[PDB]
Amino acid sequence: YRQTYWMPEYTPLDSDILACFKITPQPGVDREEAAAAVAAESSTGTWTTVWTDLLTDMDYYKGRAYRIEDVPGDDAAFYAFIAYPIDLFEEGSVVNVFTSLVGNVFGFKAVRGLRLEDVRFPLAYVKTCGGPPHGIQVERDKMNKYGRPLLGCTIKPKLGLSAKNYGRAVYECLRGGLDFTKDDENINSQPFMRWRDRFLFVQDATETAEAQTGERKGHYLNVTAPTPEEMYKRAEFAKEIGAPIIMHDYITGGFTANTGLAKWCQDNGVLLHIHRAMHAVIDRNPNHGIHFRVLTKILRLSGGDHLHTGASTLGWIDLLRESFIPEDRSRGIFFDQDWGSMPGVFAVASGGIHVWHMPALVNIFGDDSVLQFGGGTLGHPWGNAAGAAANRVALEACVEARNQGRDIEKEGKEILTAAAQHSPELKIAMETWGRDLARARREALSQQGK
Amino acid sequence: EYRQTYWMPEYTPLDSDILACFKITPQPGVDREEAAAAVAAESSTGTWTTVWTDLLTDMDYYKGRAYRIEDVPGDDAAFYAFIAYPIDLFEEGSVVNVFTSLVGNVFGFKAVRGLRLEDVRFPLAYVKTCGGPPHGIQVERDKMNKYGRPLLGCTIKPKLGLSAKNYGRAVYECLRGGLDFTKDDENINSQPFMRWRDRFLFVQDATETAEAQTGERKGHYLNVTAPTPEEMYKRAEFAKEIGAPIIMHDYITGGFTANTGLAKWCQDNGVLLHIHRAMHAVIDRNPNHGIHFRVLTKILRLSGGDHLHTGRASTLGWIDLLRESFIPEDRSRGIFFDQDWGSMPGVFAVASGGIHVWHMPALVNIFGDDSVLQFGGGTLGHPWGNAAGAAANRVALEACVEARNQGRDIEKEGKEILTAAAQHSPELKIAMETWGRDLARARREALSQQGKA
Amino acid sequence: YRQTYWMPEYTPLDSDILACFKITPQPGVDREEAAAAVAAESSTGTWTTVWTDLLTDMDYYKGRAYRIEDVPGDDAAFYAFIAYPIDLFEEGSVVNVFTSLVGNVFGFKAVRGLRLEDVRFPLAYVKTCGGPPHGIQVERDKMNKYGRPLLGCTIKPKLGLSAKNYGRAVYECLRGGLDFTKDDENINSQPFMRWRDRFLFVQDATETAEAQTGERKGHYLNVTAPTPEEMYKRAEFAKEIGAPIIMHDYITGGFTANTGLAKWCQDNGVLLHIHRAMHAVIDRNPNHGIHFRVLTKILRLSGGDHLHTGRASTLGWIDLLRESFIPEDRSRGIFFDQDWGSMPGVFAVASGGIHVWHMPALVNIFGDDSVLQFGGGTLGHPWGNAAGAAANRVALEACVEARNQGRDIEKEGKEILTAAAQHSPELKIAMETWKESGRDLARARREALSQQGKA
Amino acid sequence: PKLGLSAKNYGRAVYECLRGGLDFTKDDENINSQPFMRWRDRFLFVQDATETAEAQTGERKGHYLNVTAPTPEEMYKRAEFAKEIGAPIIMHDYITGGFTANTGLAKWCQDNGVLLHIHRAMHAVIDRNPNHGIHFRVLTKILRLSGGDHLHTGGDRASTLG
Amino acid sequence: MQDYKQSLKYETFSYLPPMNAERIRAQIKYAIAQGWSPGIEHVEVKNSMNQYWYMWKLPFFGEQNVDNVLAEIEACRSAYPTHQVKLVAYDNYAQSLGLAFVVYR
Known part of the structure; x- marks a missing residue:
């Protein structure tokens, strides 16, 4: 996961949707593999790569974990900040943005608990609703x-x-x-x-x-x-x-x-x-x-x-x-x-x-x-x-x-x-x-x- | 307090009743009969209070009522409340209304540490409406x-x-x-x-x-x-x-x-x-x-x-x-x-x-x-x-x-x-x-x- | 008709539609067989069992006579009580329930007179109307x-x-x-x-x-x-x-x-x-x-x-x-x-x-x-x-x-x-x-x- | 405005x-x-x-x-x-x-x-x-x-009246 | 038990006793202090549910003298002694009234 989806130098675009996930990982997981896993599981669904991926611009169509922060308290939890290009979603559809962020990642076995804290809706997407x-x-x-x-x-x-x-x-x-x-x-x-x-x-x-x-x-x-x-x-x-x-x-x-x-x-x-x-x-x-x-x-x-x-x-x-x-x-x-x-x-x-x-x-x-x-x-x-x-x-x-x-x-x-x-x-x-x-x-x- | 109205261990459910089983993890001060009763009230007639408008109605028919309590095998902190709801509390053919009614209020009840809906019994007479x-x-x-x-x-x-x-x-x-x-x-x-x-x-x-x-x-x-x-x-x-x-x-x-x-x-x-x-x-x-x-x-x-x-x-x-x-x-x-x-x-x-x-x-x-x-x-x-x-x-x-x-x-x-x-x-x-x-x-x-037979 | 449609030990389910027919039988027919006939004629109406029946669950999809009583003050007539599984009918259709119960059997020649006295509509069917x-x-x-x-x-x-x-x-x-x-x-x-x-x-x-x-x-x-x-x-x-x-x-x-x-x-x-x-x-x-x-x-x-x-x-x-x-x-x-x-x-x-x-x-x-x-x-x-x-x-x-x-x-x-x-x-x-509970x-x-x- | x-x-x-x-x-x-x-x-x-x-x-x-x-x-x-x-x-x-x-x-x-x-x-x-x-x-x-x-x-009046 | 006595109302502050000159003043002072521009309106009693009352003069934009408003309220009540009289405070950021209430019913 970390190879593709952990992008610490990525500065989000004003048009990206951003999500802040409070991750509680199992004891032996590095925070960046967990953050990259949550970016991937809430955007592309997988870590692998099949031949149909190579028909597409894999660099553009994916969520990016671009920063990780501590939680005051729960030293077993960290905030993972994730960016999603505005183009992953249908316009005018809270249903599609919502499905995409929370429809899949919350069953991820590798965390003890996942908590979606906040979502940055860019003004370019607000204007479609x-x-x-x-x-x-x-x-x-x-x-x-x-x-x-x-x-x-x-x-x-x-x-x-x-x-x-x-x-x-x-x-x-x-x-x-x-x-x-x-x-x-x-x-x-x-x-x-x-x-x-x-x-x-x-x-x-x-x-x-x-x-x-x-x-x-x-x-x-x-x-x-x-x-x-x-x-x-x-x-x-x-x-x-x-x-x-x-x-x-x-x-x-x-x-x-x-x-x-x-x-x-x-x-x-x-x-x-x-x-x-x-x-x-x-x-x-x-x-x-x-x-x-x-x-x-x-x-x-x-x-x-x-x-x-x-x-x-x-x-x-x-x-x-x-x-x-x-x-x-x-x-x-x-x-x-x-x-x-x-x-x-x-x-x-x-x-x-x-x-x-x-x-x-x-x-x-x-x-x-x-x-x-x-x-x-x-x-x-x-x-x-x-x-x-x-x-x-x-x-x-x-x-x-x-x-x-x-x-x-x-x-x-x-x-x-x-x-x-x-x-x-x-x-x-x-x-x-x-x-x-x-x-x-x-x-x-x-x-x-x- | 809820116990007196909503805790009815003598009730046997009608076959037309919707039944629910909640796993209740009560707060340390609250005893099981009162937790079961609150859950039952907050998911049917959402109050312990009696105001004058209630006396206009048959308060005894129009309520959920808890009717049985059980231990949770291997968890002393939690227990099961079994709750019955008259088929009349719900719009027919509407899982939206039975859902809202069961889970749309009670899950914020502060006198419980954790509430989990385990199973719902849908009676044949309500199934035939969907x-x-x-x-x-x-x-x-x-x-x-x-x-x-x-x-x-x-x-x-x-x-x-x-x-x-x-x-x-x-x-x-x-x-x-x-x-x-x-x-x-x-x-x-x-x-x-x-x-x-x-x-x-x-x-x-x-x-x-x-x-x-x-x-x-x-x-x-x-x-x-x-x-x-x-x-x-x-x-x-x-x-x-x-x-x-x-x-x-x-x-x-x-x-x-x-x-x-x-x-x-x-x-x-x-x-x-x-x-x-x-x-x-x-x-x-x-x-x-x-x-x-x-x-x-x-x-x-x-x-x-x-x-x-x-x-499994x-x-x-x-x-x-x-x-x-x-x-x-x-x-x-x-x-x-x-x-x-x-x-x-x-x-x-x-x-x-x-x-x-x-x-x-x-x-x-x-x-x-x-x-x-x-x-x-x-x-x-x-x-x-x-x-x-x-x-x-x-x-x-x-x-x-x-x-x-x-x-x-x-x-x-x-x-x-x-x-x-x-x-x-x-x-x-x-x-x-x-x-x-x-x-x-x-x-x-x-x-x-x-x-x- | 009797061996398949007379079930004196069947107890009606609460989902069942029940009928009470007053039957006046022809002189040479027994009450068992006439009840079972009315049940068959008002549900499967089978005069010859054929191969397509064997494609279905014949025990479920049938009316069944389950009790017989005397008519007080009438030795010539009797009451036949019949159960019909709720699945025999279209939901929310008195048309279909009516047609099913009374659409065929009143012409049964083997009976002198037939009168449908009462019908038990189970709650689970009432809720569909x-x-x-x-x-x-x-x-x-x-x-x-x-x-x-x-x-x-x-x-x-x-x-x-x-x-x-x-x-x-x-x-x-x-x-x-x-x-x-x-x-x-x-x-x-x-x-x-x-x-x-x-x-x-x-x-x-x-x-x-x-x-x-x-x-x-x-x-x-x-x-x-x-x-x-x-x-x-x-x-x-x-x-x-x-x-x-x-x-x-x-x-x-x-x-x-x-x-x-x-x-x-x-x-x-x-x-x-x-x-x-x-x-x-x-x-x-x-x-x-x-x-x-x-x-x-x-x-x-x-x-x-x-x-x-x-009165x-x-x-x-x-x-x-x-x-x-x-x-x-x-x-x-x-x-x-x-x-x-x-x-x-x-x-x-x-x-x-x-x-x-x-x-x-x-x-x-x-x-x-x-x-x-x-x-x-x-x-x-x-x-x-x-x-x-x-x-x-x-x-x-x-x-x-x-x-x-x-x-x-x-x-x-x-x-x-x-x-x-x-x-x-x-x-x-x-x-x-x-002039003049x-x-x-x-x-x-x-x-x-x-x-x-x-209780 | x-x-x-x-x-x-x-x-x-x-x-x-x-x-x-x-x-x-x-x-x-x-x-x-x-x-x-x-x-x-x-x-x-x-x-x-x-x-x-x-x-x-x-x-x-x-x-x-x-x-x-x-x-x-x-x-x-x-x-x-x-x-x-x-x-x-x-x-x-x-x-x-x-x-x-x-x-x-x-x-x-x-x-x-x-x-x-x-x-x-x-x-x-x-x-x-x-x-x-x-x-x-x-x-x-x-x-x-x-x-x-x-x-x-x-305008120039002539065309406007026109 | 006491029996509730029904009568007409006029939105904010009308379930309170009427206002002399001192309590009106604190409301104009609040409004000016919120950046809102006070205005004065009046309409026949039977038309107080109208969305559009007769406007007295214009809104007092940039005005910071409570006594200047108070007097115009008095001046409107004199021009139309049978009309209701209302005080409003236009909020330009929200495109709303930060406050409104009737001063003479």
Whole structure:
């Protein structure tokens, strides 16, 4: 392997895809044979040479291991940096780039563990992908929502609710002050709630709550389906009935399906909320799998307008949202990632948060985020509308504080208690439970280029 | 806390229930009943909380519930939770929804160190809702006119850099040599150096030319894996438009939605569907955290394919899962539930990956007739060309099958059989120098005379 | 026939389709051999075993008689119980199941009479069929109607009425208090009232009465048609114009058409009212033909949202139509457990010469999840269709308010109706005009299986 | 600016213009579907601007939405969406888009009641040198036959009036 | 339990008590400090869901005097006392509004 595939003097081209693999080799392997093996197994599949290879330019069509680094800690693991000429891949196909990097090497017997940490998508390849159907800024304009994170509520129980009872919980949430409610990942078209009936009553709920609040309202109607035809049919019905946003399970429904849904959403002006169902099967083992920041770049190319994003955390949020993200090893960002004009994707926070988390969530995620309260909304003692108002008051007072200059996370309890003197719903609720870097680069480049 | 609602050791599963077996490695503080219960809740009704909306529903029917706990032989850190799910929790005919429901949330549960889905029991009433293989083994054999032996394939290398016409030339040489199939690699889609439509024209040209010169049906797994469903289907239609018998898909990297749709399209159009399991090792290698390949095997059979790559004990476990009509429980092979497929057809097991003439006796002895044997370098690497390597492998496969049919022990007698055939075959001789169903049939007989008894 | 098709030790598998045939044998044939013949004639129909049979697995691919019982109070007839493996049939095709069971054997000369009494559709086969497009609970939610049986009128005369006059009767009925009016089963598209004109004026009537009452109205527009293309064209026009409900004659139009129409109704959100015209040709003779409870099951699988249900047997097939699980009960002609699972249930429809004086017995026999369709009992009111509709609607509610209060509404019938007329002049005039647990079992079993599973 | 305005900020300028008293606003000949303002977003917010200014003035309003596009599929897709949302007039660069696209677009526009504003982008590459090229009055006749409801026409006065 | 009281809303800060002159001021100070250009808009109450409000004057580009904005807000509220009045802060890098909110409902 090392003869052909370890190329330490190779400086990558701006058009190459680059991959950073954290290799954990067996005790008797030299780091360069392992790095050259991973370059070869993720590009040409072999070490040998048969007569058909000599019909081709073997020097151009191969991945190159071009640098090896230590891992702070695990002295039994090293980072292997690999370059792939842009021509190994079909344009506009996260499916083909993804297949090529991870479709084969991860069974390699010669390593104890393989972990794909990051992938440098060159700007020449980004420009071939459809990207977000709309992206953060177009979505704020469509929904007419500026100055705060958006608020959402995943409806529960995921199971056993009729369409109409389901619509009831949606209506009571949206009228309370939440921007969005959300179908669960597992809600597709089950016997207790067929999709067509759910879509109708949810849309009823959405228009009734919108007319009673004068704020635009959304609900992520989940179109994840058994086949592309069913997926598209469901997306078409949401458009026919006026629904402004739909949802897809991009990993379990799949990249081919999702890339297609994203492009249909842009063709049809339908916002697209993305769920990362099953990411943890893949991204949780720090020694074997694919890191969620790779999964995050895949989705932005493929297409999403929202994405659930759970140090590392704030790295992949930048990757999801900003125009340029500089290399930052302290955040596991191993390469500069340039996105150009490809719009960024709303970062979605979820999982067991309530009013007490509000000051931190506004602090950490910033304005261009969606904050999704499951039980934090429904579990309010006075019902869904009261808990939506509580969450909306808390969010808005944490934002007014931040704007006023205060350390919202330290003055958290104080900010909240003061605004609860104007909102019973909030007070009872308390009792129950990157950009500047990207723009600095644009200005600098506008003045003198390189 | 989950234990009270989701731990039901008194529950006996209905025959219509989906069952799962998780290998749970709990954190040091958590005891087994509570881990099993959390897993069951986080993969069905994803909470311990009772909010008012739950009281609108029958919380007792609409939940997964853990019903049995077991030790893991030789691992005290881990244990098995067996969990039952009412058939009503899932969209019918949608492995996308059963997959999402089972594995789309629970794997991030912080109170567990490692979670691994070992097996899933699909009830007959849910199997009958899924399309299954577009043809399956026996129908494909009829269409292709091949009986009494494993099928033979070769994957074209290099995977990168070949023009459409150069590629078809390696295909032609292989096929005319006696191989039944050739194969696009998983990464072969539509890259700048070989656009997909050009590849399809020249491969099909090679397929027709080799079929004319041999008198045996030929095919080449044309890869329709694509960025979008629209591109996938367009590529599939063109392969039918030109007369190709078989196409190919990367069901995991393209996705379960696209693949179910492709299988449906294939069955509606008479095109065989060869399935590649790319990415699977990301998921099924680590024995403490992920999804075992035998689960990935069952989802493919239900989603639809006519061939699946299958790669000791577990390996032939999931082969039986892939091909046979009924597979009884067997923990010696990692089969944790009886799996009844009914009349849903079996899928060819495909063996590939660094194999040559010398592996033939073991391959025939292990996979049997209803398998495809894929040779990478083992055909391209022959020193007289592709045609001769194809012939060498074809002769060595046939000699093993004739030897097996005759009562010989083809593994114990591997060298002798191949040598005795080497004498009538210069291609094989120099190539030698360079390098279960009984059970399902028994149960069907018994259930025919006695029924339920 | 006997040695291969009589299997008294076979126990049916849960995947099996089961049939119960009442056989009246010819004088000189034994019961064993006649059961085995009915099983063979309704599955393999072999009169001579030939070489192609030996190419197949003959033990699997055959119906089999597995039990025989006496017919209580009839020594000349007996019950033959037959199992068919699920593989004998095309999935999701009542057409294929029907044809297989009843397409050949009723002409068996060696029997004096043959009557198919019941069919056990196993869950694993139920899951392959589309079922009702909506079902009782979805429909109630779509129409925003709860706590009382629904009320309909069938427009008469069936013949001679222009599209506009026909809409006039519809308008007068709907505005007085009925939820539904109905096309007769013969009303398709005849010269005196072309269907497109009928649909337009009925929809106009529907909308006008709906605006004047504030309750959702509907009218079962009959799309029974010469051809599937005409059937689907008529259904599409009802959706185009806003109509919530359509009607099909599923027997006379036929199962292939009906199954496709139910699929289309679910895909388009149109409710589907099913008329059982022709059934008495098939199901009236107790010795020869197909019992209506089979035809009930076929319709639930094929698809419908209402079904006309027209004593002990009657209450039995209503359960089969509406409930999620129905236990065996020979006293109500139910010969096998029938599990429907999550497949929704269907509104039962009562029609045929009923007026206000039947209302207590109707609310009491049928309960809430039913439609009470008044033919002449609404139109015949000496004050018109609106007053007749209001009278029926007052009588319906007062019987519901009585029953919710605990009263024996059927015994105290003439009293509840009389206290009601003291506020509705329309109900009073109508009273001088004309003279004179299935749910709980299903719930008990779902809860039982929910806590214990197999027990 | 022809560059860098989002769809919504673009619509704001259109709205403020239209309500002022102008009958039409206009995409620039270079405005097609650039990354800072995708065409669908632009059409929606322009049409919103158009209707809002029309309702506030009681005078019919238009905005030449520019359907110039890389292929005739894209051109026709964008034209239909303009009719679909109610826009009364669109716009095409007949010379740089080309006479085949334009004659086809003119025919579509007559079949669909949509007015067609024509931009003579690039004419001066062709019609400026008085000793080599094609005089603009030729391009003027071509456009009329090809089809347009408006054409940009301005020189030495005599020829211009001509 | 207390019963939630439904009423119309107007997006950011409208679930908070109205703003005097001091709390408005801190919002204009935030915006100017973020590099955003403040602007003022107004529209009849029944049209507040319109995407395009009437613009008061032009955006205050490069403007760094909070009191200059505050006064123009007052000046707009005087010109249209029945109209709603909104404060927006144009962000030129993102082509978005860094902030918007109604000051008089």
